[PDB]
Amino acid sequence: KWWSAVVEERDAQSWTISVTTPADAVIGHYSLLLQVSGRKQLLLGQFTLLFNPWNREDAVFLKNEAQRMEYLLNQNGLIYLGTADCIQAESWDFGQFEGDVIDLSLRLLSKDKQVEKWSQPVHVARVLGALLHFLKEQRVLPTPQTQATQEGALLNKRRGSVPILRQWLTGRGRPVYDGQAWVLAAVACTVLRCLGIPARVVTTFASAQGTGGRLLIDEYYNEEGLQNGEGQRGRIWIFQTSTECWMTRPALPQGYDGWQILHPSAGSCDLVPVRAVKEGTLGLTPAVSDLFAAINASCVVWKCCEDGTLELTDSNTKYVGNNISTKGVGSDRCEDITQNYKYPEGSLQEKEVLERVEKEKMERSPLYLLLKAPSSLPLRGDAQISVTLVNHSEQEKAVQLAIGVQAVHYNGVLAAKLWRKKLHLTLSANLEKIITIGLFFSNFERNPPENTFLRLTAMATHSESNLSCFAQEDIAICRPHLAIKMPEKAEQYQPLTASVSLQNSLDAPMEDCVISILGRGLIHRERSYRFRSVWPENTMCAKFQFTPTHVGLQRLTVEVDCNMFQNLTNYKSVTVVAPEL
Amino acid sequence: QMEEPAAHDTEATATDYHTTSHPGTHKVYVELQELVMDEKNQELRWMEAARWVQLEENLGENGAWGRPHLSHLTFWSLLELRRVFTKGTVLLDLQETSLAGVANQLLDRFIFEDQIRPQDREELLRALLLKHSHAGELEALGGVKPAVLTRSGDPSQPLLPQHSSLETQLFCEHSPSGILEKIPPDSEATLVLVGRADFLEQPVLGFVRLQEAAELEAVELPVPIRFLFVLLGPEAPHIDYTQLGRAAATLMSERVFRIDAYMAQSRGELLHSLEGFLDCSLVLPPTDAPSEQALLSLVPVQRELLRRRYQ
Amino acid sequence: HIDYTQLGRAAATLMSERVFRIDAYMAQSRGELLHSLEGFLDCSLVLPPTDAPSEQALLSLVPVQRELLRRRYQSSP
């Protein structure tokens, strides 16, 4: 159970030792020395210590074997982006088994000086979370506010995490801008998997960041139906990434072993188990209430006016913090784990738990509408959007309808205004009124930004009274799909062919088509190729040939860069086996 | 109709593939092999021909290594070496453990830069993976004679003077343990392979530095391999692949150059180190002066050149 | 990579050879001058920079230039 050394077999000159290691020791670079009874010390070599989830008495232990492979031995992961309705997978290379990633992680860890807790990975997780959050605050650049679409391909292209770590530690690489600040979770997952703690990145859609302890968010809309001013303290973000670690809590009461969300504080970090979040144990960790409020919060809207006096309005309720998803186990399909955080909606358990929450905190329509909009918009395309209005009164009434479409960042930051329209209607004898309109890519007053989501706001103003109705929707923009053809199986040291095709579904001619391929264990670093013009109706097809070298399950990803858009990514997996003897 | 794209090159994202690790310092043992054919059986194979443990050691037709000696070069050797290194293909920090994978990646990179035509891939790959004999089996073979790769693969005699090399002729006409004692314990191997292919159109050079040293099973060397050179091409005037390999070995014999190769991250650094090496070399014309006095008059200029070398 | 002083020095040393002097004396076109210059470069001896020079090693090359001299006079009366 402690350090020991037993000679397994002895020969004339060769001796075999099977050295035992303690189940909980300080990790780092070690040195082995030998002392003779009389003579001096002689050095043997160096070695490195890591955790392992294969030991049942270790603090880190996972019962399943495949789950160890995905959460510790996998190097090609997926990140889920988009809105809650449409999900996009992006292939990421964590690359935790690179040559010098361990050196970077150890060198960064060496700035703690609490050496006695280096054998306890809870403290290690806390200090690394704090350090990475501070470094992210240090090294993330604000976006260049100037308009240069020609060089957008070199500003938003990602090649994995190893670089990000190299640029954050040494500052000798391509820096990262504020438009992609969700990579912090990926960096944390990479370094944690490097140290031997399994971790995984989850994505929460429509998460209310900002406010601490409140379940109410105020949003103020302009008189026209737009957003007056810019920014807010706490807003509803489009999505949020976070890191989850599998660990046992020895200092905590019984029943909290398992998954823990790592949440840094604006430095200092900490982590909280999932079940504690579900029950609502707010006195268990200072960072419980703020995280809990972000998964179920209410928003109310004030409609600004010319005088400036704000009046509360009746608006349609929106869902906050729903459809939590992550990478599936053993496959490439998304899996939802939102049930681990919340009770089922419209049930008892959520009702009593929430009412306990309110109690704990306090101790311390004649007309309306509903609207149908598509969940996505094809690039350079069009879509029809409908709204229906109903009134409930014996008399007629005049109404004023205002509709606006504007871009927004992924963290609730506005980008630009895109479209506006106003009309007037009259409802009589409580008859339904349906209005379907078309919206085109040519109707925009400017070019929408590269990484933004559209938000549409509809405002119905009642002429006689002051109460008025509001609604909004979130739309994403979908880009043309590209097809990849390649065999599911292949043999080592043999030629392999792949084909890629695309149909130009846009309305503009193609020029400067550049496509690149890459993949770990299949190709070298990356390879790029030119192309000719594609007209708005034709299809382009190409083929590539290579030779796999590393056995097992690999994958390769291609990306297309163009004049209309940048970084159009796709990927495909494959299995390669040893040659037949 | 299915169609292929045009190769494009850019340096937009090379920065992502630069390591922060120290390459480390090692001595290097340089080894040279060439493709020849043995009179016993009509089959091509690679013979070792020279080594650079401390000085250049040459192996004759009988199979006895001569006296280690100075590595003297020729003007043409360095001339075409620079000419082919100027537009060569390099593969840095490759992660492989077999000769087959290295060959496949190098062939793919050659096809990427149009150094070789696609239809020569199979033949070159097959020729690169033949069995690698050693010095001991020469007595089991009884001698070899030079040959050249052919489209059909059938060996033929080259249509060029096949006279023996002058270095062997002038330095030939217990050793493994001796060289193992001479080499430092921390030394890594560098391999150069030379040969001739008739269906090619231009000599091609390939430089490979592995991410870490490995002991390839295909060819036996006492120490793991870190660097590797490939020389191929058709027959041209004023060229000699043996002297090209000798010049490559002598270039590898420099401490500063191998340091630069260890820290190298692009072809430009290797090129710059190559011009730096070329600047500090001197040429001795054919003169009728006494040899010993001419060599003894060399000490001040060579001392100044070496003094200028270390900046 | 041009030093005009060294270019003149190389021209002078090229003029120093007896055989090249005879070639220049009988030359009737540029082709034979090119041939003689290429032959002179063929018998040229280049030595690289080293790390630990010694005269014991430097005396190991002594036969070659003698041979080279014979080769340089291989086509000479």
Curated annotation (Swiss-Prot), chain A:
InterPro entries registered for this protein in UniProt: Ig-like_fold, Ig_E-set, Papain-like_cys_pep_sf, Transglutaminase, Transglutaminase-like, Transglutaminase-like_sf, Transglutaminase_animal, Transglutaminase_AS
PROSITE patterns on file: TRANSGLUTAMINASES (PS00547)
Annotated localization: Cell membrane; Cytoplasm, Cytoskeleton
PTM info: Both cAMP-dependent kinase (CAPK) and another kinase present in the red-blood cells seem to be able to phosphorylate EPB42.
Assigned keywords, A-Z: Cell membrane, Cell shape, Cytoplasm, Cytoskeleton, Disease variant, Erythrocyte maturation, Hereditary hemolytic anemia, Lipoprotein, Membrane, Myristate, Phosphoprotein
SMART domains listed in its UniProt record: TGc (SM00460)
Top-level taxon: Eukaryota
Modified residues (Phosphoserine): 161
GO biological process: cell morphogenesis; erythrocyte maturation; hemoglobin metabolic process; multicellular organismal-level iron ion homeostasis; regulation of cell shape; spleen development
Gene Ontology cellular component list: ankyrin-1 complex; cortical cytoskeleton; cytoskeleton; plasma membrane
GO molecular function, one term: protein-glutamine gamma-glutamyltransferase activity
Membrane topology: Lipid-anchor
Function noted in UniProt: Component of the ankyrin-1 complex, a multiprotein complex involved in the stability and shape of the erythrocyte membrane.
Disease: Spherocytosis 5: Spherocytosis is a hematologic disorder leading to chronic hemolytic anemia and characterized by numerous abnormally shaped erythrocytes which are generally spheroidal. Absence of band 4.2 associated with spur or target erythrocytes has also been reported.
Subunit details: Component of the ankyrin-1 complex in the erythrocyte, composed of ANK1, RHCE, RHAG, SLC4A1, EPB42, GYPA, GYPB and AQP1. Interacts with SLC4A1 (via the cytoplasmic domain); this interaction is mediated by the SLC4A1 Band 3-I dimer. Interacts with ANK1 (via ANK 1-13 repeats). Interacts with AQP1 (via the C-terminal).
Family, per entry: Belongs to the transglutaminase superfamily. Transglutaminase family.
Name recorded for this polypeptide: Protein 4.2
Organism (species): Homo sapiens (Human)
Gene: EPB42
From Swiss-Prot, chain B:
Effect of residue 246 to A/E/S: Impairs expression at the cell membrane
Keyword entries, A-Z: Acetylation, Anion exchange, Blood group antigen, Cell membrane, Disease variant, Elliptocytosis, Glycoprotein, Hereditary hemolytic anemia, Ion transport, Lipoprotein, Membrane, Palmitate, Phosphoprotein, Transmembrane, Transmembrane helix, Transport
Cytoplasmic topological intervals: 1-311
Effect on the protein upon substituting residue 118 to S: In SPH4; Mondego
Keyword match Phosphoprotein: yes
UniProt-annotated location(s): Cell membrane; Basolateral cell membrane
GO molecular function, one term: bicarbonate transmembrane transporter activity
Expression (tissue specificity): Detected in erythrocytes (at protein level).
Effect of residue 56 to A/R: Impairs expression at the cell membrane
Residues covered by region (Globular): 26-253
Disease: Ovalocytosis, Southeast Asian: An autosomal dominant hematologic disorder characterized by ovalocytic erythrocytes that are rigid and exhibit reduced expression of many erythrocyte antigens. Clinical manifestations include mild hemolysis, intermittent jaundice and gallstones. However, the disorder is most often asymptomatic. Spherocytosis 4: An autosomal dominant form of spherocytosis, a group of hematologic disorders characterized by the presence of numerous abnormally shaped erythrocytes which are generally spheroidal. Affected individuals have anemia, jaundice, and splenomegaly. Clinical severity is variable. Some individuals are asymptomatic, whereas others have severe hemolytic anemia requiring erythrocyte transfusion.
Protein name (record): Band 3 anion transport protein
Organism: Homo sapiens
Range within the parent protein: 30 to 348 of 911
From Swiss-Prot, chain C:
Tissue and organ distribution: Detected in erythrocytes (at protein level).
Domain of life per record: Eukaryota
Annotated spans, Dimerization arm: 30-77
Subcellular location: Cell membrane; Basolateral cell membrane
Post-translational modification: N-glycosylated.
Post-translational modification Phosphoserine, affected residues: 76
Related illness: Ovalocytosis, Southeast Asian: An autosomal dominant hematologic disorder characterized by ovalocytic erythrocytes that are rigid and exhibit reduced expression of many erythrocyte antigens. Clinical manifestations include mild hemolysis, intermittent jaundice and gallstones. However, the disorder is most often asymptomatic.
Family to which the UniProt record says this protein belongs: Belongs to the anion exchanger (TC 2.A.31) family.
Function text: Functions both as a transporter that mediates electroneutral anion exchange across the cell membrane and as a structural protein. Component of the ankyrin-1 complex of the erythrocyte membrane; required for normal flexibility and stability of the erythrocyte membrane and for normal erythrocyte shape via the interactions of its cytoplasmic domain with cytoskeletal proteins, glycolytic enzymes, and hemoglobin. Functions as a transporter that mediates the 1:1 exchange of inorganic anions across the erythrocyte membrane.
Assembly behavior: A dimer in solution, but in its membrane environment, it exists primarily as a mixture of dimers and tetramers and spans the membrane asymmetrically. Component of the ankyrin-1 complex in the erythrocyte, composed of ANK1, RHCE, RHAG, SLC4A1, EPB42, GYPA, GYPB and AQP1. Interacts with STOM; this interaction positively regulates SLC4A1 activity. Interacts with GYPA; a GYPA monomer is bound at each end of the SLC4A1 dimer forming a heterotetramer. Three SLC4A1 dimers (Band 3-I, Band 3-II and Band 3-III) participates in the ankyrin-1 complex.
Official protein name in the record: Band 3 anion transport protein
Organism: Homo sapiens
Whole sequence portion shown: 275 to 351 of 911
